[PDB]
Design a protein around this nucleic acid. Sequence first.
RNA 1: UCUUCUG
Lengths: 98, 44, 67, 257, 479, 8, 87, 45, 576, 115, 93, 82, 49
Amino acid sequence: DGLKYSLATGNWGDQKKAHQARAGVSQVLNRLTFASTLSHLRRLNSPIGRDGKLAKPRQLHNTLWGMVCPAETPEGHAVGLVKNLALMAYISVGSQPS
Amino acid sequence: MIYICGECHTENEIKSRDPIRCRECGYRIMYKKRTKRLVVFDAR
Amino acid sequence: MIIPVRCFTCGKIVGNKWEAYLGLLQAEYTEGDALDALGLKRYCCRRMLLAHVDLIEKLLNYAPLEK
Amino acid sequence: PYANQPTVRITELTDENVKFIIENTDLAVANSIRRVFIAEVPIIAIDWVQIDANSSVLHDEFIAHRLGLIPLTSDDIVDKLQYSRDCTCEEFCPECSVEFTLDVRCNEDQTRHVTSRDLISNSPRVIPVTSDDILIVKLRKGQELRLRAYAKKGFGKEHAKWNPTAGVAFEYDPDNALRHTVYPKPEEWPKSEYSELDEDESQAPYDPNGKPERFYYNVESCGSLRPETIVLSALSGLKKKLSDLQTQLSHEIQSDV
Amino acid sequence: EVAYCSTYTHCEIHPSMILGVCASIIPFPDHNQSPRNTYQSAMGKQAMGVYITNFHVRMDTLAHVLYYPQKPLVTTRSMEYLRFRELPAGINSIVAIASYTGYNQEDSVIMNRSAVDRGFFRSVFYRSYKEQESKKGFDQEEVFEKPTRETCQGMRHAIYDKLDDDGLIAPGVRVSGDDVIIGKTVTLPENETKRDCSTFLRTSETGIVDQVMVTLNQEGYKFCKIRVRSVRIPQIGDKFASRHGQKGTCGIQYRQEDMPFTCEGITPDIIINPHAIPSRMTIGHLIECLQGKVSANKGEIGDATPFNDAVNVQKISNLLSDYGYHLRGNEVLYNGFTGRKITSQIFIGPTYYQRLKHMVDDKIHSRARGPIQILNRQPMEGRSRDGGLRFGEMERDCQIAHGAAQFLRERLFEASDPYQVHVCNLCGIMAIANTRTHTYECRGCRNKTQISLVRMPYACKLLFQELMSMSIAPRMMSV
Amino acid sequence: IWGIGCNP
Amino acid sequence: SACPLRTIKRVQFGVLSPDELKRMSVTEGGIKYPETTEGGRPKLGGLMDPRQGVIERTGRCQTCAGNMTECPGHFGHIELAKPVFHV
Amino acid sequence: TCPNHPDAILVEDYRAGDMICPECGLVVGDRVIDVGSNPLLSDGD
Amino acid sequence: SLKQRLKGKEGRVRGNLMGKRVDFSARTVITPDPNLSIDQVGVPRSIAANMTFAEIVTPFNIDRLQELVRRGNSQYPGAKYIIRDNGDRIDLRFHPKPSDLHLQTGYKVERHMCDGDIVIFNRQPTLHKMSMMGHRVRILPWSTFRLNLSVTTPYNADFDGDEMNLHLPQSLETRAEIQELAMVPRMIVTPQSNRPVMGIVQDTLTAVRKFTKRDVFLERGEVMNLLMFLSTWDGKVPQPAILKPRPLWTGKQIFSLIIPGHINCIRTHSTHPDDEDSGPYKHISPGDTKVVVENGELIMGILCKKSLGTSAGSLVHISYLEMGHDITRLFYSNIQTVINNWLLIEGHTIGIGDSIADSKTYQDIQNTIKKAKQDVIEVIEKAHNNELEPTPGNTLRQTFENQVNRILNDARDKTGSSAQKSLSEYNNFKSMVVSGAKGSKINISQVIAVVGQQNVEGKRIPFGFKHRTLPHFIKDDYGPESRGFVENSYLAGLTPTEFFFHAMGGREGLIDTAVKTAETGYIQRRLIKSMESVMVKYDATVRNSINQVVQLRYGEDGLAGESVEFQNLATLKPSN
Amino acid sequence: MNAPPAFESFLLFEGEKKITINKDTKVPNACLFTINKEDHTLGNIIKSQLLKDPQVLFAGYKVPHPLEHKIIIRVQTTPDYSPQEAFTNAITDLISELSLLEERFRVAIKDKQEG
Amino acid sequence: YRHLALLCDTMTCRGHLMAITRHGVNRQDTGPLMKCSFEETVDVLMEAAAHGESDPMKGVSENIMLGQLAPAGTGCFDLLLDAEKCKYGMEIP
Amino acid sequence: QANQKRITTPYMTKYERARVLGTRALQIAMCAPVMVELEGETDPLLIAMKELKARKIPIIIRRYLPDGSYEDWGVDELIISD
Amino acid sequence: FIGKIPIMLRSTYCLLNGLTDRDLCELNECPLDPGGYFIINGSEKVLIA
RNA sequence: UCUUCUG
Ligand SMILES: CO[C@@H]1[C@H](O)[C@H](n2cnc3c(=O)nc(N)[nH]c32)O[C@H]1COP(=O)(O)OP(=O)(O)OP(=O)(O)O
Ligand SMILES: [Mg+2]
Ligand SMILES: [Zn+2]
Ligand SMILES: [Zn+2]
Ligand SMILES: [Zn+2]
Ligand SMILES: [Zn+2]
Ligand SMILES: [Zn+2]
Ligand SMILES: [Zn+2]
């Protein structure tokens, strides 16, 4: 139930405690077009609040060359706060340091 | 009141308040058959 | 999903030409040569056959809902 | 104050194409004839479909649309047939319609291509331009399509299914002499197939007195009607439209006075 | 070369891989303005096409599938890995950038009605409705059956004839708005028989039932999903966009006779205003039209990788010059209405146009004396609930600026929440009032004579009562 | 996108 | 309906007197029962008081024949055992 | 409860939310639908 | 809590009292319609059928309302309800007794909305007063609201998925208020800037420039067709400007018939040479600029954004100020119809042939860029040798950036000017820029010559990586390409690094748009709340609700803002 | 949902007149003809033939709205000629032109085949 | 200039610089309901209740809230019927 | 106030014209007698416009000065803003 | 037994892993479907990074 | 209560 709840609701935490829960994770997949499905799967979400209008986290940074698509961002209140991976980008799964 | 079955595609008549299970396969996903009344389609 | 009857722009019947186009492609004709042989001359008609994606075969792969 | 006397020369006449030149005619008349080719030449095409069984991947309305677009031979019977609105009988009768019936089931493992040849007409004259074939739908094994359809007379102004022609080519003043189109760079533009100029000269010298005349046509048919018959029927139908206007105008003129 | 760096340690595989999935479908991205590529990335997510090949099996809410998808005539090499050829979203359309009748002005688009009749940009909309027969209630059982007006005390006057014995409409039956897709009945505890619990079609759906399925869900209760199919012929409100950020509705539809025609007989499927291009600087659209003309004539799908250096406009122009057309892609057009050559030569070429999910039928709403909310006794909100449009505070400020006091009063009081209250004259607090008994008395004063009727919005009455519950007394005195 | 004095 | 129609020309704001609250409230003796339901539905001296307001969209409140529209609702009072500061 | 029709069944309506006498069309009740609006576990809490 | 309910937005105080959801309102997508007049709006039939305006039965209109009652809800020009004297409402849909259908004076029949019904049209956000204007209703057979293109500028609406709200007044009093205060023709001129709000736009502006050129000559039949779409034509064909050899009218001659009444106006075309006024040919203008209208006739000049647009002294502004609002409404509509029907003959297009320039121009642009890069290199070498001297008030880094930016900007502008020289008369980019319909000289320059420097946060592209903009460039590279200068044009295509830098600039633009919307909304609301109650009393003093005198006379001269005009005193400047 | 039926473009609904003749008060010897359920096809031919007539001072056709189906034709003739007469004669001339064209097209067809 | 001068005059009318904020606007001695519509809301109402403030009902927002006709244009004046003129003229109906 | 010493503008304000025409039209719709002979005018608002042109509307406008006094201008006395 | 873990589609622990396209068609699952989403309560959910 | 779009 814990795993199922956190996936279904979109709140990352427990049922009793929503104070530390992070909303916006586990959205329903968009199936309007195959491109929408693919882009929804390859998506990054910056944790900066949408309500704050400070522009530094939104601007495209030089270090996003080849890791994140420069053009593909939502236009509106989340410009630059939602990003899509580039085609060749591969996020590291992780390894032991031993 | 004839339900086509997803798994084995065999029509099974089901009465009201009867379990939705297809005989000969046991699948629980049934489809209602196409209505007998006919609809005129304009080719337009 | 299936080759359209009657090319949209002019209206020439192009639905009878899909299998012939595929066969000519198998005969090692270039796509332009196959379009020329089929009689498609205006670029509106050639767009129909050249850009068609036959998804109905992929749909036919699935087993029928009723046998 | 009287109509110009037009002339016609037919340069090419094939099974699917007619090229002709109309001379000593106004531009408005020529363009209206071109327009009548597309929108006001009556043809018989399917307009009513009752689908009994459709197990194909394409949905029912998809099949109905594709059936409507299939051309049907209407060379001579279209003049005899009456519009469904004109016919006194309720719904459709052999005088006002033609009945097509299609029954195909795929029992072989190989995919069955439902083609226009599988359409069966009660009237021998109206056939789906078969005498390859237009593919209505492809059927997997165990999939069945059975339908019954009626075909009505109509013209392209209602729906494009009743458009006799594939492409009507209309061109006048092949070498720009009336300067109806002003080329920014005359040299770049390709010469017309009907152009009479030498290769050196891109445009003919401007003729202020000249007016549009000697209009060039190229009418291609879908096989529903003979390409000659499209032109003749268009001329006759435009003549009928003008005559109906004249009758109604006489009624109004007499009634007012 | 002239020495810049002699210590390169790595090399890029290809610069076009910086772009993502949605931006990779843009042809000639480097020839567009940057905001336009950003806008196309969002519009391409909303385009219509076959989303997945197993769409017949799937029962999804709000599924659109285009009749005749086509792969782009001008395609990027990176599109192959996105499987855009396999599942395209859009149709190559002969597009003329011209001002024809003024109906393509702003961002609108003139579309060919004859092409629309021949299947151009036709789509199907599937909507699935789910209902669960819940027996969890102690004495409440939501049985699936066809409700009967005489048998069920609670019922509705919408059409119930469609429902079969099981309470589920059979596939292949047309359903118009306000028809009963599923009939369900909750047995009513006899405190001392039936409150209707059927599900009704969304207004103006006007579709034919495609599939009806009956299963058992996770909870084990009987589950029924019904999918309704509606074909969607393009109209004069539907939104169409190219791959270069140019979005616009369909201004008007002209038949093939009315559309301008080339000498060959080709009439544009879509006419877009020339005024869209310059300010937006989407030259990629123009280069795509040129490459599409060359590709359709040559018979090879054109290459539009972002950074190529082997494909230039001049090379495409020469290639087109070989095929008998003007090198820059312009064509002499004839006016459909009169037949006269248009003096300017119009730029015509094939361009991949998409059809977005936003359609006028789904976005049209009208409200007139509909249901009201419980808490505020004000009109509902939303198209589904027949809600009225909100008259915001900015709107009321505009009306104040106009000086239209009575329209402001109608819109903010009479149209929304008219109400009447009885207020004691001696004390501003409202007083109990029995209209049928015709006795009106005020508590706290022991006064009956001095009571006055006051017309106020119900929201204002609620505000005053909420102030009273906070111990504030909003004593409204007529004097 | 033009210059420092223009627009971005 | 017999009362003349008047338009408010002045709104006077003041803190409600506890005595005035006692007199004005239709509920007498306060809300003695936390439960909202007695005799099945209605709990006299409870949170859901028939005299306080119209219930179920068909009933009539005891004080007036509201029929869910005419009645503006009527206030009730709770007599706190020991006084409490208002926030 | 149509005043001119003793014992008349008033048909419900969804468009405006009212019960209307079917034989004369009189609207009895103007806007009287509005919105029209776990008991198993435990009890009243 | 109670305070929580009242306090927040969407609470009782603001979300349910100051604004609230309303009945008799409708919303759908808007699409263009050049044929509709300025005041007309095209309403779909379903929206018109749902919305009803109650009409009182009078002895004059009893027959018409009786026919509407007989038609019922099903037939479109029908009546949904009958409201009797008692207040009883007879819904006609459910069967009404034939006795009930009978009408007498005092009954109120709720007819369906018909052609000519005044409605209020709104588009959120409602920034200014012109965003809610009263439109007459014309029912047309599709499901989109259709409004004239000139009316788009007040609403700031284009037809790319936009939507608008339709509110139908339900009483004769409020209908008269809208008719006489908020109708579109009455609000052509804004009091904000004493300029006309609405002007000829898009195809009609671009085509009016071409129509009004000296070159345009119209033959007899074309003049017939153009005059057919002129609503105010006297029925008299003007005598052609060229009687022989062949009778040929001129574009100005036909446009003079559009001009209302007798309006006198002198304006200048956008391409007016500065030296022309001083030198000879001042009145016989060689370039056909200097628009002059005498006695409501276009003597000379090429019309453009300045003459027919939203600016002070425009022909439309002089029409509203002199002729009145009604004749000006007809003026707008007639310009649109006649010019749009001429555009069918002439036509407009945008193609790649417009973007491409002569080879010599391309070589000149390339040479300018070469020498600019050399100059930036020289400045860099001066900075490295420390020969550069700091500008007063600036650090050496700031002064280096200043000089480098000056060099790059001068090169950018020079390349743009060369590109603009290359443009021919037939070039359509130039047509749209010159007419003012859309675009700018900057856009042409970027399309043809050089995109320009990409600046983020007011500086060249910053060093996101350690001391270098992108991993491909060498550390400590202050040269033109490294810091963001895009040498290639849009037609030529941006190199990959330039593509990323251009994306950075465009992202800054998008972010600025998104931020500005919210901040400006807050400012606007606060201003309105502070000054909402201030008004001109019958003393003509401007007082608030407390009756405190804000101003003794409005604007200190007691005049309204729309009537005033710009004028020169002419006693001030001259010498004694 | 609000789409007009396709047959509405060319079919007169009951009680609609194909031609209505209303005189023009502004100018002498001018009549304004309204043709219902017709399009540019008929209007352009009629206007052209009217313009060919020396006695017709003015002749033009206008479709008031593309969504609606109507033609308005304004004909002004010299005194001693009537606008209605000009309209009738224009229709007769157009019919004669079309008939002659049909005969010559049939002859051309017969000559092209087997010749 | 009228629109600029009006804002400047409203801000500096009282003799102390009145910011267009909750503080400056709400401090001015307007009606409590009008203050309630702008920002502070409930707190303004509580203070007004404590001090026994009375709303003059001369403001536009206050009349809008209570559903009465606003004192704005078309509400500044009150129309009265003219009996003598009603008697005169031709009373056709 | 007295009939003398009227300080308000002689011209009818736009808002007064709007409300007078609307009110008179509402009265005409309720079968009030119409002073001006109608030439086949059935719409109440148009008849009200005709009456306003003839200055026969039977309404007297009471203009409230900010000091609390009122000045009663008849519709006839006021100059029409048109 | 300590519980149930939702399974991302077409991952190694899903039933669809290592299945030929014909077999995916036999299960009425599209060969081109990317995977990478969980089916929780009948709806496909995607964990945004 | 959320998320996602549309301006
Ligand atoms: C032109 O201004 C409009 C309006 O100001 C209104 N609007 C839009 N979004 C918002 C928002 O979030 N908040 C508020 N308050 N208003 C908003 O939309 C603005 C423009 O936006 P755009 O720049 O995308 O318009 P294209 O230039 O893009 O037009 P294409 O070529 O696609 O048709
Ligand atoms: Mg827009
Ligand atoms: Zn089975
Ligand atoms: Zn074609
Ligand atoms: Zn028959
Ligand atoms: Zn009291
Ligand atoms: Zn009560
Ligand atoms: Zn009754």
